[PDB]
Structure formats: structure tokens, C-alpha cells
Design a protein around this ligand. Sequence first.
Ligand SMILES: [Mn+2]
Ligand SMILES: [Mn+2]
Ligand SMILES: [Mn+2]
Ligand SMILES: [Mn+2]
Ligand SMILES: [Mn+2]
Ligand SMILES: [Mn+2]
Ligand SMILES: [Mn+2]
Ligand SMILES: [Mn+2]
Lengths: 293, 5
Amino acid sequence: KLNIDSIIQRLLEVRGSKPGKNVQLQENEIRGLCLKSREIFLSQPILLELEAPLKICGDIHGQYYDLLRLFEYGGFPPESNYLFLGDYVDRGKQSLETICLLLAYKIKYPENFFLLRGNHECASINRIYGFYDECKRRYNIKLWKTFTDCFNCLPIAAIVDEKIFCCHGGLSPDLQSMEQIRRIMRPTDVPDQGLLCDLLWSDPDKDVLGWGENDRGVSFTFGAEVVAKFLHKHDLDLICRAHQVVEDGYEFFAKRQLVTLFSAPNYCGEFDNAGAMMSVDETLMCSFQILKP
Amino acid sequence: XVXXX
Ligand SMILES: [Mn+2]
Ligand SMILES: [Mn+2]
Ligand SMILES: [Mn+2]
Ligand SMILES: [Mn+2]
Ligand SMILES: [Mn+2]
Ligand SMILES: [Mn+2]
Ligand SMILES: [Mn+2]
Ligand SMILES: [Mn+2]
């Protein structure tokens, strides 16, 4: 019933229009995107096991014309396989187009296109930071509630060729095994502190060596010793994460055992940061493509 | 505004 190809065509039609130009999909089409993608999310593991070649992207935050630049640079699906690390909505002016395009590609290419949950794919947060207001202005609050149901089914982590562990935020002091992630049942809002909360919210910090206090008011910070012990225990080579604005779009932490990716250049119209994307090839070589501010 | 503007 859902015309996926026509939705994609209408979303891609504003390529090379004035940045900020809207695509007003019909409410029933947006609801169709949410309900179909949710079904696919639930049929696939909550801990994704993925294989290279793959382009990995960090926070987008509703900067729709920047998302199109990422695809223009990386190859529009299905030309390349993609993993996004979350934070699709809030902050920018076009969360609607942003999330609609990524959900459309998930439906269209369900084995070649992947999306993880970030801390902004959570009703409590997206209420304050822009996505609720955008839905109220352009559609209604019932559609925002619909997105909420879809977001609650997103997977939380990915492992790329048994070697690169991928999540939005970072590690947890309650994380002992990969089974703990697999035990997590969906749909879930994130009502309690603990493992799921930490995977969405936690931050590396060079001035703690173990676990520390997080300035955000939630979760923890983790030091280099933590990253090292984790990568050892589970026989892995790298943590790939997002969640923090960094100047060059990518930044290494903990003696290059972790990388942060941030994919939205000139974040909020305030920072002078680049955005970046990590390309992992078939021989597990990593490279970085930079989007200029 | 720290939730990170
Ligand atoms: Mn135009
Ligand atoms: Mn309403
Ligand atoms: Mn295990
Ligand atoms: Mn973010
Ligand atoms: Mn985040
Ligand atoms: Mn910066
Ligand atoms: Mn370095
Ligand atoms: Mn370091």
C-alpha cells in the first residue's frame, strides 16, 4: 500500500534546492514509514552482526541538507552499505525529512541499510530539544507519538566483522557479556538507569582511568583502562561511537582504541566543527571522509 | 545546553 519509491523520489527531489526547503509528505505516508520500519527493526537482532564494506555515520540532528551531502559523498543507497549511530532528530530545522529518508531506505534496503538508537530517539528528550515542536508545527502531536513507537524498537549496538563494536554513547559498568545486550526486550522507552541508558548516554574521559561522573546528569564517563579491558574480554579491535561534537568530525580516544564520529557540520549554527563518516573496507581498513563546515 | 547548546 506504501509507495516507497515515490516517497524517496519526493525526498531526493530537493537535492540542489535552497537549503531549508521542505518536503511535505502526507501524514499517512509518514505513519506508513514508522510502522513498516518498526516491523523490520523487530525482525532483526537488537545487537546487529554486520559485515564490511560499510560506511558508518554519527549524529545528524535534523540537518537534512547535510545528510544529502553525506550520501552525495558516500554513494546513495544501494551503492554503499550504511550504519548510522543515532541522533537523527532534534536541534536542526528538518528532523522530519531526515528521519523519513532514513526510514524509507531501511524499508527499501533492509539488509544493506542500518540505524542504531541514540539518546535523542527517546520521547523525554525529543520533547524538549526540537522534534516535538517540529511535529506540532508541521503535522500534529499524534504523529510525534507514532515516531516514539518506532524509536522504541530501534536496535542498540552493532559489531562489524567480530572486531568493531558500535553504539551511540558508550560502555556501562553493568556490561559483563554480549548476552546482556541480546536479553534487552523491545519495545522499550528507556525508563531506568542501567545498561541500556549507558549504551545511549555515556562518554569517554581522559581524566578518569576507571569510571567517573558524567556532567550530563546521567550515566557515567569511562577511561582508557575501561576501553582496553572491554576490547580484550570480547576479542575486539575498536569502539566506534558518536554523541559528542568534535572539531574534525572524527576524534580518537584512549590510545586510538575508540573513535567518536559526528556527522553534522556547523552543529546548531554555533560550532565550527566538520562532520565525518567512517568507511570500513573488506580487509577491515578504516578511512575518513570529511564534510566541510 | 550539557544534555550537548
Ligand atoms: Mn529551488
Ligand atoms: Mn494533536
Ligand atoms: Mn558473549
Ligand atoms: Mn547528539
Ligand atoms: Mn547523543
Ligand atoms: Mn568543537
Ligand atoms: Mn590521537
Ligand atoms: Mn588518549
